[PDB]
Amino acid sequence: QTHVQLNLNVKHKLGDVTEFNRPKFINFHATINENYWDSANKIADLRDDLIRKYDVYVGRETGMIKTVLRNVKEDPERPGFADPDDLARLCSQNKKRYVQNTKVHPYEKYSNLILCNQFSPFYPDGTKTLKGWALSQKDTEDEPFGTASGEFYGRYIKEYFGEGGESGEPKPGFCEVINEPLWDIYDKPKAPKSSITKLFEFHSTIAAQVKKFNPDMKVGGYCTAFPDFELQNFGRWNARWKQFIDIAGKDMDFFTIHLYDFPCKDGKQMYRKGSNMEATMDMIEQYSMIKLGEVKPLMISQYSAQTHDYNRKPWSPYRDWLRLKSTNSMLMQFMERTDNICYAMPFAMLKSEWGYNPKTGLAHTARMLRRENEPESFTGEYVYSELIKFYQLWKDVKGTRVETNCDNPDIMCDAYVDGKNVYFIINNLDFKPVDLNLSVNGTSKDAKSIEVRHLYLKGGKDGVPILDVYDAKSLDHFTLETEATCVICYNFDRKVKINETMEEVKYYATDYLKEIAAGKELVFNINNVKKTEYGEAVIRLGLGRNHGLSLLPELLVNGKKVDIPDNFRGDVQKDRASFFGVIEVPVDYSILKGNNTISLKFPDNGGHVSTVTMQIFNFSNNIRGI
Numbered sequence: 001q002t003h004v005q006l007n008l009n010v011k012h013k014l015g016d017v018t019e020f021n022r023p024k025f026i027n028f029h030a031t032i033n034e035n036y037w038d039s040a041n042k043i044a045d046l047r048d049d050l051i052r053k054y055d056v057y058v059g060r061e062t063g064m065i066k067t068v069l070r071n072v073k074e075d076p077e078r079p080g081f082a083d084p085d086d087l088a089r090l091c092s093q094n095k096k097r098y099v100q101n102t103k104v105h106p107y108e109k110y111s112n113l114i115l116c117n118q119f120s121p122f123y124p125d126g127t128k129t130l131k132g133w134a135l136s137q138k139d140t141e142d143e144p145f146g147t148a149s150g151e152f153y154g155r156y157i158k159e160y161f162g163e164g165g166e167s168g169e170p171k172p173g174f175c176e177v178i179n180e181p182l183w184d185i186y187d188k189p190k191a192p193k194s195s196i197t198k199l200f201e202f203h204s205t206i207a208a209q210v211k212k213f214n215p216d217m218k219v220g221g222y223c224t225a226f227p228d229f230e231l232q233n234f235g236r237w238n239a240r241w242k243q244f245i246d247i248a249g250k251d252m253d254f255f256t257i258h259l260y261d262f263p264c265k266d267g268k269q270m271y272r273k274g275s276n277m278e279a280t281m282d283m284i285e286q287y288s289m290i291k292l293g294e295v296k297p298l299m300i301s302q303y304s305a306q307t308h309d310y311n312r313k314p315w316s317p318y319r320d321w322l323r324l325k326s327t328n329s330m331l332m333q334f335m336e337r338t339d340n341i342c343y344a345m346p347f348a349m350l351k352s353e354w355g356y357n358p359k360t361g362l363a364h365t366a367r368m369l370r371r372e373n374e375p376e377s378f379t380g381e382y383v384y385s386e387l388i389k390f391y392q393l394w395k396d397v398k399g400t401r402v403e404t405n406c407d408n409p410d411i412m413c414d415a416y417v418d419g420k421n422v423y424f425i426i427n428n429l430d431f432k433p434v435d436l437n438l439s440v441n442g443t444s445k446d447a448k449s450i451e452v453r454h455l456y457l458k459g460g461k462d463g464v465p466i467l468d469v470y471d472a473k474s475l476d477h478f479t480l481e482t483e484a485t486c487v488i489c490y491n492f493d494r495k496v497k498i499n500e501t502m503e504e505v506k507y508y509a510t511d512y513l514k515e516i517a518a519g520k521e522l523v524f525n526i527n528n529v530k531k532t533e534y535g536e537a538v539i540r541l542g543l544g545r546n547h548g549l550s551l552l553p554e555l556l557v558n559g560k561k562v563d564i565p566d567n568f569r570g571d572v573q574k575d576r577a578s579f580f581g582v583i584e585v586p587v588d589y590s591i592l593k594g595n596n597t598i599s600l601k602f603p604d605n606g607g608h609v610s611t612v613t614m615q616i617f618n619f620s621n622n623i624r625g626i
């Protein structure tokens with residue numbers, strides 16, 4: 001059995017973050033004003049049900065800005081620029097419509113918009129708009145590449161947005177430059193394979209133009225489709241994210257990526273959830289520290305699963321389950337880095353009727369709503385898809401984060417205390433059920449009631465997701481299903497007393513990305529580590545190696561041997577072309593100092609140590625009783 005401990009009197013602080021952030025995490029890729037809320041739905045007031053009743057936030061939108069770009073007239077004085085007057089006119093028309101849409105104004109408190117451009121025709125590669133002109137492709141001293149695209153974006157923001165309600169739509173919280181650009185530039189079928197660094201330069205130019213018109217706006221990039229750093233023996237890292245940080249990092253307010261699991265790509269299962277995404281995120285942070293001297297806030301503006309083998313099929317509950325299980329696991333991992341994550345948005349749209357293709361009968365593959373007669377036909381009124389089960393599972397969850405421990409790296413856990421209520425969340429990265437033994441420490445009182453919520457798959461492949469919700473008299477043991485999540489809600493007679501603190505601090509090494517040779521010591525240094533009397537620690541070894549090569553180096557920390565566990569977070573990456581993941585290594589706190597030397601020695605040749613970082617967990621008192 002796996003032992004899962006909730007220390008509900010011990011605050012878990014990370015930076016200045018001590019609380020669950022519902023807007024940052026419990027959200028979807030929608031806006032309050034899309035017209036799809038207001039027709040063809042079984043529920044008459046769907047905003048009240050989804051946004052208000054479930055307390056769900058928004059959002060992200062790229063379609064309105066695309067429509068304006070594709071239809072705006074060209075400046076007669078400046079070939080390749082949007083006409084400022086016509087741009088102001090189109091934006092004013094849209095503003096007037098927002099101003100008159102008074103029914104949506106009370107929902108602005110649920111909205112913090114991520115604005116982004118779709119790749120085309122915003123990227124100035126010669127693609128013409130519906131008006132027959134292309135954004136300027138110049139790259140001169142006075143007109144650096146992207147000047148016209150940037151001016152369009154800055155003017156759009158200035159002209160369309162107001163300050164809420166009858167003054168116009170609130171300004172976006174975040175402006176991403178461009179969606180998944182290297183997919184179109186380099187990786188898609190028949191891509192032109194034009195310059196990669198030119199796209200990075202373009203980001204600095206866009207940021208400068210947006211800020212010329214809108215001085216306080218936050219700009220970010222590069223909104224990566226598939227951040228796959230280990231490919232070509234880390235040549236992909238070196239050509240892409242490394243260069244983006246070197247070229248544009250200083251000009252970005254935030255970094256942004258997309259993270260998708262591949263549960264079914266020609267029958268293969270290639271996951272990011274677990275150790276792989278830990279390696280991706282650690283590498284961005286570590287190289288940002290080396291080059292920029294600071295970790296940049298990270299946005300994940302689309303995440304969950306891409307379901308290739310089901311993307312030419314009609315809707316099913318099973319396809320929704322594939323998305324659900326990736327969402328829950330990735331969310332837990334983003335919650336662990338809440339101090340350096342500014343926004344994480346599951347890729348689920350409200351309705352996306354525009355994505356229905358009548359030639360094939362295929363609807364959009366990531367919808368909160370589906371028509372009642374799907375999958376047989378795209379007819380009938382809209383009802384919730386199975387993706388609503390995510391928001392049902394996470395309903396009410398809020399409060400001050402408290403310490404949890406689960407002695408199986410395939411089991412992730414977290415917990416939040418909201419007055420009398422405690423939410424204990426447990427997620428399974430393993431591909432079988434896991435029996436859990438639960439301990440709740442730090443109070444002398446038993447809970448008044450326990451509500452168990454368990455989201456799992458019934459019936460195997462092509463089965464259905466089930467959200468079981470029930471009251472329990474006690475919960476000392478619980479079997480968490482394959483890739484499942486539970487949210488256990490404890491209700492107490494009186495407010496829970498939080499009287500200790502565990503402060504987590506993450507430390508980076510002085511260097512990174514070292515080639516592995518057999519028998520050759522690799523030395524990393526992690527310095528200025530602050531210790532207290534009582535604490536715990538985890539060393540984080542990012543390894544990128546071909547299959548068959550050892551993931552069990554000899555590890556010395558300050559000259560002392562430290563064992564590496566056989567088990568790490570998530571799957572062994574069998575169907576991936578190589579292993580890329582962080583191996584988390586508990587380390588005796590007494591071995592650590594302020595300046596630390598971490599030595600690795602492998603028995604075999606090949607691959608890299610991508611990063612070595614360390615989490616320190618410092619206690620306010622002897623909370624373990626050692």
Ligand SMILES: OC[C@H]1O[C@@H](O[C@H]2[C@H]3OC[C@@H]2O[C@@H](O[C@H]2[C@@H](O)[C@@H](CO)O[C@@H](O[C@H]4[C@H]5OC[C@@H]4O[C@@H](O[C@@H]4[C@@H](O)[C@H](O)O[C@H](CO)[C@@H]4O)[C@H]5O)[C@@H]2O)[C@H]3O)[C@H](O)[C@@H](O)[C@H]1O
Nearest residue numbers: 062063064066118179180183225302306308354364365366
């Ligand atoms: O499209 C017009 C429409 O856009 C709407 O806004 C879009 C904008 O923000 C939300 C909407 O979707 C986003 O784009 C994503 C979306 O189109 C999904 C599909 O639902 O696709 C995602 O990209 C996919 C596609 O291209 C890159 C990525 O993967 C690709 O698949 C590949 C496989 O085919 C292959 O076998 O394997 C490789 C890996 O090796 C890939 O997996 C492909 O599926 C998009 O990110 C944003 O564009 C707007 O709201 C509307 O008004 C209207 O403008």
Ligand SMILES: [Ca+2]
Nearest residue numbers: 180181182225
């Ligand atoms: Ca990309």
Ligand SMILES: [Ca+2]
Nearest residue numbers: 226227228240
């Ligand atoms: Ca990449």
